[PDB]
Amino acid sequence: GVRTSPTGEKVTHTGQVYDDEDYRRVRFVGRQKEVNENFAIDLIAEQPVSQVGSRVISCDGGGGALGHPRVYINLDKETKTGTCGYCGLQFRQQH
Amino acid sequence: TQLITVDEKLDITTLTGVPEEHIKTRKARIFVPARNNMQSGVNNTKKWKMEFDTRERWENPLMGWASTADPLSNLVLTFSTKEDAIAFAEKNGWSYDVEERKVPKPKSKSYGANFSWNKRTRVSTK
Amino acid sequence: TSVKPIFSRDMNEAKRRVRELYRAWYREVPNTVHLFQLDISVKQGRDKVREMFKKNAHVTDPRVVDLLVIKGKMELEETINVWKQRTHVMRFFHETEAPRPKDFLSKFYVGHDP
Amino acid sequence: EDNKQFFGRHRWVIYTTEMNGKNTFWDVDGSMVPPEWHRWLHCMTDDP
Amino acid sequence: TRPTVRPRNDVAHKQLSAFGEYVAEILPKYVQQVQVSCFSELEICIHPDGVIPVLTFLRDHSNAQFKSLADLTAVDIPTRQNRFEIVYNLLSLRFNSRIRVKTYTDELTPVESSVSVYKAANWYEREIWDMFGVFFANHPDLRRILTDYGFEGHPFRKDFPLSGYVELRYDDEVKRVVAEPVELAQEFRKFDLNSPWEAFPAYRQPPE
Amino acid sequence: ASATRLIQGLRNWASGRDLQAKLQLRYQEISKRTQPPPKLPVGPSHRLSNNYYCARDGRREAMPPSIVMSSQSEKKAVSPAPPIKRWELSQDEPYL
Amino acid sequence: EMVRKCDPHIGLLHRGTEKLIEYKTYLQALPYFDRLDYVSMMCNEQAYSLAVEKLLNIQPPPRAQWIRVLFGEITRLLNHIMAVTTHALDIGAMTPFFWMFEEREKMFEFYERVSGARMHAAYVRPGGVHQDLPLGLMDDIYEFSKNFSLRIDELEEMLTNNRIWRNRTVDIGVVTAEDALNYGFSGVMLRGSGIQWDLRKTQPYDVYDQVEFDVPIGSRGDCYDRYLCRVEEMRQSIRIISQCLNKMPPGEIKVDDAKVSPPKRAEMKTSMESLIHHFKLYTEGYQVPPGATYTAIEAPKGEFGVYLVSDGSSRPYRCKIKAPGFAHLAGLDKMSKGHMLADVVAIIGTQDIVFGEVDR
Amino acid sequence: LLKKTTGLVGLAVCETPHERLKILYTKILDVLGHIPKNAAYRKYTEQITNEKLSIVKAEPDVKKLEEQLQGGQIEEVILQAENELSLARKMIQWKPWEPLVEEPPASQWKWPI
Amino acid sequence: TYKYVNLREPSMDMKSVTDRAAQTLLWTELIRGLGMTLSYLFREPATINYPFEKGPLSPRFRGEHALRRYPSGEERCIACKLCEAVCPAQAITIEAEPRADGSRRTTRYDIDMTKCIYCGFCQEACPVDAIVEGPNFEFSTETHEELLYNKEKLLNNGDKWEAEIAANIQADYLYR
Amino acid sequence: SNLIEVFVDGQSVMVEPGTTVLQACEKVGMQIPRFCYHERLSVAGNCRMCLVEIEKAPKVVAACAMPVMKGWNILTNSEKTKKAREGVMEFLLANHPLDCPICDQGGECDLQDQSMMFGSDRSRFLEGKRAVEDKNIGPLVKTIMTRCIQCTRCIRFASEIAGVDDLGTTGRGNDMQVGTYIEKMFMSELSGNIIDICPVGALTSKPYAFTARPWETRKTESIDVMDAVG
């Protein structure tokens, strides 16, 4: 989900964009500013929440030794889902 | 007699090769470093340290890194006692200041004070 | 308070050694200018030699000035033989270095350095 | 591929004559190989 | 303690202790300390005036025969008033042994050169003079050996910064390589990695 | 290995050795570039009982050096070690 | 035509390695030892690892020791190939340079397969080795060592019996034994004069006392005897390589003291203690007990020593590197007295001089 | 046996090792007779030199003399005798049996700081 | 335990003397060297046809750096700064802040490819396999500034070389 | 004088009556590990990390709360003291979350430091860990109670120094939690000191969150000018 500027400059996923009166836009003159078109914040928002029937859940990121360290997520709160601190996947209790 | 008498103060600033504006314009600080409040260990507060004042750091125009022009920015020296640090600073021609070591005064600890009969030091819970 | 001497027992022989080193440098300056094809005159080289000796002229310890004479002798031997290039000889003259301001007002204008 | 040749010549690539709009008839490049074939060509694997 | 702990040698420890007693008793005029480490290494700390006699004895005695000089080093410890510790490592091919002889000096006191005993000491203490500024009296040819020809200051001292005071660049106006005050695009980041907890209680220093 | 028999014969005559027995160019005799996955063994400390770290702490058994002499009879002279043994000539190829 | 004085000016590659080592931890200081002698990488890594393990009071597992000795012998083959071929190239023969550089490329392939880097592997670490050998490596090592005998034979055919080659080496740089001992020489320079000394035989390390090999001993101290000693050391390295292939034991590769060696990546992502140890070992590093040690090994250029001084923290207080090229270049003045200019370049060649280890 | 070559470059073969070794050991004894008796260097070197002299005098053959002297060839034994004589003269000149010249400072050999 | 290289005495009978003198006069060993170099002429050369043929490599090869992602689009780096702590050349600069949804993510991740010694400590100090050293090695640039990678360049390298980096990691992760 | 004599590792030391084992060991330069003891808080004695062995006594005592009587010999580096330390460290790390890369206490964690120094090197736990629901106590202190070790410095500080008495312990057994039991904001003028005294990353500074790591920060000792206390 890239965004443009009134200058015409692309805005990175960290929110950086050179100012209109900034002199450092001259480095892109005759060249291009490289940005990543895949925004991870927008990409992790499309993952559906996983519904489980336990009070706690365990996440390793998938793949076992190829993922993140295994963490345990509590699902006692009903107002919010339980997000994994590493991979960003969220879980919800079935009840 | 193979042993001559020199009654002058020890000064070696003409041999170290340091430029003069890094000698006459620098303030050395001699101090015992404070214990980090995030930890209860006291092994880092045993030795005296001498360091220098922080000069200007600016931003790189290309990448935004931290650029400096001070060669003494990372110079930290370790001494066992205060007088060794004082003599090392005075030998090298650095104007220095000294901060006294701060030690924790002893406390009076009693587990039975948590359940006093008539004193305010009772604990509301445990 | 008794210390082991290096070469000089007291200040007189140390001053003699300083005198001899200055004489040797003063003699070699024209040959250094000619052999290295320097852009300076002989007078500028001799003024630089005198300036270094005058800069280093506030010392009263015989061992310190003995070490200073020793290091000057090493530099002179390093220059007599062609071991230094033209850049090492010309590094005494800071031609490309910008003039550092000295008064308070200009230092206040240019930055935070005292 | 040609497995009778010795190790080093037993796999090779003939580059295309036009990649991403650039004429590569004489201007071939080592960075012209996509990664899925880059793993096979450098003998990091046996399977194309 | 079998698989993951280094096995201890005790016969070598006993032999090295006996030879340390032997040396410290033959030469009481210069020997100040004799110690044997955990991993069976013998260190003899001597007075600086007896560098030539101790080394000549260790080279020439029938019970020593330390014919090889492996390494000669100085160590900079700024808290001591004699901040430079000069270390000789000797190897004896006859008895298949190694010894360490240590002495001390400060910035202004010269040390007697050991070229007249071991010939590797020429380049070794030329390097020591270049890096620590320790003068060696009665040297054949003492100059710099590793630093630049116009270099000022001794870099292996601990008050000398990591990056120096000058840097080189090519200037087109003078058509020459010139030295300028050092400026870094990125400052060297200092890391405070020391743990605030004591690791080895056996090396604990007594309080004041 | 693609050379003809005549070139092989001339090569072996001029070299003086059978070059075809030991070819410096590798062929299909080497191991494959794709291998089955391994299963590495574990060390001796991978145990559930009698595995206290204080019984196998190598670094904590290190001691400060023992001071033999400090400045604060008819005993025999002592060498640093027994004298080294004379080397024996090689039985395999003494070059003699 | 006769040389009266030789003054070798060095310092053109003085990087200042020791101060940078003093500013970093031990794991960070290992690649500095990788880049010291850039033809003898694993030997320098092994010397550093041996010194740190001596100070840490730990010992590596046996499989790591056998791997260390096998790769030390492969490193010896690389170093001797480079030394002899560059010596011949400087004298004027250029064919064996290419002929043995093909096998050098093969050994570089072995290094890359085991570590991922062709030259600076950073493989031998304090506590063992970083990664286990992949499957099928030792078969390729066996085939290469099977053909290396014929490779040495062909180099010896080109070089040894030639009258032009031996005319440049028969009476050049003769060193007496006592002068070799006094000048601090080690390794092939000591062995060419007849001194029977070898650190793998007299003061052995990991499993070098379990392998059988001979030691070439010269008789005249010239360059020809030193060249013959290097060729025979190639042959003995092949012998030790075969013995190490036939006696490889099973087991782990790092020491199981997880406060020194980092744990596996599978147990790091599951166990709390392993995760804490991984964090602290890759940020702060292991603490070495206070003390000073001198550890010397038989590198292919001679006695390679590390003098390591640790103050108890996770970074070394002092790290002196004793290199044999320093002493050999110091003795070059005595070597090249009463000789010609071409004899001077042959004398420089017959000392295995890499200026990365000389200037440091 | 008349060994052709000692094996070490620059070390000439001795034709008469017994007379050379006896002369060198007696010379070492006469030089060491000037050192004071309470000096440990004199006692230790007299002991080892007397042992070596008795061993040399008790063996007419050279190969078994080399084997029981434990010093390699007989020529390096002669070299070590010469080096010991030179050291004995130098130690007469230096006089290192005197008490210690100077005490070190308080924390001269304290590690770590 | 030792052997005597070059201690062979020459025989002094007439056979050996005439053999040595004939070798001197007729140049036998020179013909030997000539003939063996001739034999080495008639062998197939070991030259490969670059760039059409590439030298062999391994799944452990350390080339260009890349930043990986989880198999859902989310990036793997969680700004723990272990790679910049373990870097022996101090080639990594990391700056972090909590982003919009509260996740712990980097805002700056620079690697100086002219400072880096390509040692692979960062890819083995990473707890989540975020930073990797990919198999690419042909990335020579015409400018110094093109070798100063920011976060966007490393993420683009990861998206470019994922199909090979994941396979190499799958092949090698059981040895770690 | 009223001082009595005790021995630490065989070394004699004169201590005042009422001195604990921990302070006596501190008098000779030995710092016994702690997780709950604070010198400016009351003694709780529940973490059991300070279990030291007194010789000629078949039971380890809690050094933070045990007073010394005369003639006692304290063995700070004996075998069973180290065994007790290893067992208590194993029990503390049994249910701790694997959150070290994502936690701000990393590099300055007391649990990490004296697990590396005094604990074992591997885990025998083959079960599943617990998970604790996070709480909200204000915009200043970020709360992640899965990392809490129930050291109860929270309640002792908030009751004896801040004088708020809002924090407490609710539950029993392994389900015991530290919190306020209601949606209450612990808003005082001394709230950040509970971030300071937490030995683990359970309470962290929300403005400082995810910004730096402790090893790379340069420290400058200065004086606060926000008020006239100095």
Ligand code: SF4
């Ligand atoms: S490969 Fe090594 S030098 Fe390069 S960025 Fe990674 S840790 Fe730093």
Ligand code: SF4
């Ligand atoms: S080690 Fe991995 S997770 Fe940690 S900061 Fe570096 S790339 Fe990110």
Ligand code: SF4
């Ligand atoms: S509180 Fe300490 S042990 Fe727990 S996750 Fe944070 S750094 Fe790791």
Ligand code: SF4
């Ligand atoms: S949150 Fe921290 S200070 Fe509070 S009880 Fe838990 S561990 Fe102790």
Ligand code: FES
């Ligand atoms: S410190 Fe004593 S029980 Fe916690």
Ligand SMILES: [K+]
């Ligand atoms: K905290």
Ligand SMILES: [Zn+2]
């Ligand atoms: Zn997850």
